[PDB]
Symmetry: D2
Subunit: 341 residues, 4 copies
């Protein structure tokens, strides 16, 4: 409860996926250790689960997600927050100037309220959850025999979703979340990024601005502003790595060996087993001041759904996002190209 929470937020509830071409999102869920676990009572949409992360696969045609997918490709096409009271939130959001998104509801099914968010993605406000009570219990039908609490590679919750937005728009969306939900900028990065945290301490949505770089090509390939990477939290990254590598997950190529030598200059006495991080390509960041250890282990997938990739992170006291790895990696590729030509 970090500051005033007028919308009654209580963390991420679920993320929605859709693609214009079929069979492109199912196999990606598999390699990240997610399991299909239920199917909608009426619609052609499906629930994948791992730890406490719910992921919805929307394959409904002429639906709001398939239009979003028709324009952006394979994508994160929806995003739901947990709220205490979702009509108090939905009303307050429309009073403060949000535009509704009508999600068509079938008979005997739950009217899910959304507003227009990033890229035109619906932002749902959900006030039912918990076993037996959840919207998965009400509106979904679980697979016979299958388990409803799969643990997979050990991913626990969504840590954050970071958006890429067009030059200028970072301040626009930053006011969107500040005005309607009372988000606050907790961090700033100048390499350009604003780290918007929710008053619940769980919902983190970083926003990124570029020219001629990694962000500008994302907006070209995504055909608009959208979620660049989804970050899953894990209790142990190296074990999640093995369990993820066991099931065909592909990661970005490890940094040069130089990167792992410089670790004891960068973060003296971090305590991490460098052999184990070097054997997997895992990165590390944080700061080490006066006996207080704040660190962060993270590794990225390659791009998997169009220009969207994923992050697997374990936090050891650092509430940042790996920002130091950008300078750390350039000095690494630098010393390693120097050492060879």
């Amino acid at each position: 409860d970090l500051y005033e929470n007028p919308m009654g937020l209580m963390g991420f509830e679920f993320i929605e996926f859709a693609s214009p071409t079929p069979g492109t999102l199912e196999p990606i869920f598999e390699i990240m250790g997610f399991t299909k676990v239920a199917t909608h009572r009426s619609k052609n949409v499906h629930l994948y689960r791992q730890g406490e992360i719910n992921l919805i696969l929307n394959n409904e045609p002429n639906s709001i997600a398939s239009y979003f997918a028709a324009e952006h490709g394979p994508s994160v096409c929806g995003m739901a927050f947990r709220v205490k009271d979702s009509q108090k939130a939905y009303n307050r959001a429309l009073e403060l100037g949000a535009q509704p998104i009508h999600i068509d509801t079938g008979p005997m099914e739950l009217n899910l309220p959304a507003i227009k968010g990033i890229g035109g993605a619906p932002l749902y406000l959900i006030d039912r959850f918990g076993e037996g009570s959840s919207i998965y219990d009400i509106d979904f039908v679980y697979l016979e025999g299958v388990e409803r609490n799969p643990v997979g590679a050990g991913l626990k919750v969504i840590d954050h979703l970071t958006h890429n937005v067009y030059r200028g728009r970072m301040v626009y969306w930053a006011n969107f979340y500040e005005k309607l939900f009372n988000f606050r900028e907790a961090r700033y990065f100048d390499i350009t990024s604003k780290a918007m945290s929710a008053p619940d301490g769980m919902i983190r949505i970083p926003l990124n601005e570029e020219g001629a770089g990694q962000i500008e090509e994302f907006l070209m390939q995504f055909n608009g502003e959208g979620i660049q990477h989804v970050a899953f939290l894990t209790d142990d990254l190296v074990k999640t790595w093995d369990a993820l590598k066991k099931i065909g997950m592909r990661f970005m190529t490890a940094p040069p060996d130089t990167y792992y030598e410089m670790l004891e200059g960068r973060l003296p006495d971090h305590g991490e087993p460098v052999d184990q991080l070097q054997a997997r390509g895992i990165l590390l960041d944080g700061s080490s001041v006066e006996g207080d250890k704040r660190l962060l282990l993270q590794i990225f997938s390659e791009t998997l759904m169009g220009p969207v990739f994923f992050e697997f992170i374990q936090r050891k006291g650092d509430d940042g996002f790996g920002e130091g790895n950008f300078k750390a990696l350039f000095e690494s590729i630098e010393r390693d190209q120097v050492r060879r030509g």
Copy 2:
């Protein structure tokens, strides 16, 4: 079981009430042995229960039930059938020509399908039922601590409810329940459903007690709801104990004629006659298909309730009409 169930009916699920005067519907559920059990998550609507009977009290203003109540006063303003697949039924009713009634659904609540039925009241088609999965477990907040399976005076299910329609419209409403739900007829018309549990009898007709209902009710509508019980003498002493008002007893001449009209019925005539309970049925080939029944006052405008116990008779107490008539002649003559 009887025959084919193209809409998958599985009994009555709930009936709904509305009134344009407050504090008039609650006292009537109470002396009928119903207990407030749950309150809607957001609207001013309430769940009263006894046995497996579900009574929704709708006090939501500017709504479907209030506009209905403003025209017809205290009424049964909605009726819900239970169904296997509510979506296939909804579209089937519509493609066969039914009209939809849209019921305004709040955020995070259940979108309830209904067509327009008798007198304009919504006919809901509900496919969520049973403990933990019904529409009350979802959209209603049970009074915390309160026993949520109250049994009360021992009323079990909604046996039937009947409709008073204007002259000529018996056929119109029989068709409506024939075309859409495959009801079969088994002046009155006893329309029974393919699931063996949903019975809707349709009455017409002048200057009599149906003419009086359609005046006092301001249109077609449900005239009485009948709740079944297993021991009507037992249900009677319970229902009396809490304040029920019955229509007053026949003249004792009605009881002199019992073993003449229903030879060897076997009922404790004294225990019945002490409570004004009616009898009806037939005794043929030693098979004594019989039934007990009593009614109440008009309690919601011209609407009242019947409390029946079925000892093998599939009827509704019809012969009680001629049977009472002769009890008033043989009492007038001896008066």
Copy 3:
């Protein structure tokens, strides 16, 4: 401007017709001297006209009129009032408890507001009218060459539409028009009828209650409350009669010859040419007190659309509805059966 007119009423605008079977309403319009004069830009609905009476033929399938026609047969299925400001009226009606009826509007076409009236018939509130401005100019397309102000047999305006309602409901609908439009009961008849006039002096809607009579059979055959007869006004009834008889109009059988002899006892010095009324079956009513002549000539068609019939009336100072003709006709059939057996 007879009393306070909060809804800003200015007479009848149009009457709407629909039948479950085709070719049953077109030939009836003909014999009453109405002319097809336009067709809707998009919908399969048509304008018939004569003097200032507009009549709409709605043949649109799955429309609100075809559902009303599916239940009541050939019928008057809609009714529109002229108003000064139709959103002030439509708002006020919904504040005072009327239920809206949504009439589906096509693109580039006019949203017509209605509320639920008698039988579930929509009551439209129209604030555009007058040549060039009317809804017929906006939403309708006139037939090439054809005239747009046909005069026919000389029928001028709708004088009144009288409804039949179930026993008891006369007071209900009387409060409907009193509450929402400030109608007042101007006459009462005990034979049972309430004569509801509008605060503009033009809109007249009598309501009729029955048992075992002319009204009870109407509700049986109409399958509900509805308009029993539509009354057209004419400047000269006997000339309208000839012009109507010229085009195949069929009337109710004339009263006995007895009826026309008793006329000078009933209404001394009425001045009407009795030969001309007797030659046509036209009826007469009014009262004759102290040099003031208030009279009323009228004749009825047979039933033409199911149980619905029509009235052609000419008013000479009597603001009634022919009520005296009910007693006048029984005493007529009485003397005439006496004079023969």
Copy 4:
């Protein structure tokens, strides 16, 4: 005439403006020579006219135009094509995959069809036009007495309007106007319509003046609207007389290069250079396809307007880009 017109386009019908600050849009229509002529029958929306150009000022709150204006400031927030059959076009656009924008229509008003076009602004499809039968004769109340055909500074039609889109989205919007309306391309892309009158050029591109527009505008949108006139020197003295602010003149070196770049153009170079007017075209085979043009300041955020006169050139003044660039070098060197 050019080629087949599957949506039956027949020119621009109106453009719509909205701003989230009051009293900022009206002064700009006035110095541009537009006159308030009509006011909506019920909403706070207004019709400004000059020539055959129709400008709708939408000040309706809690509406489609205000939400658009709150995001992008003073803007062109809607654009209407004129069409033979608006219903067949509407359904055709939808069956080809366009999305609908619903515009909330009051009682007794016209239900205006629109799809979602550039930047999210409605693209209306209007089939009522001309005097006595247009949407202004119906839904708008003309100021009584006011001359309803004002001619002003002699601007006639909307020549074109252009869109600034983000990098890569030129193709996206070309397809959108190719698939739905059969526009043909005839960094920029000049999309022209099958009716020979509707031209929408699409621009992208960094750190330049398009990057600056999509920042200052907060998305894709119309960057300038161009109104055609028959005598641009005449339109200039009129437009100046009433307060127009132009982008200031080229350096005189731009005029030393005219008869070098456009041999024997024949234009009164002194009358142009006194007004900062630009020239462009080609002279080949004695056919001198040429055009005159001037722009204004940014007047609605980063949006401005162009006033062109076409002497046989079908272009947009493109060569003026290189032509000015060389006028700033040859002026910097001599400075």
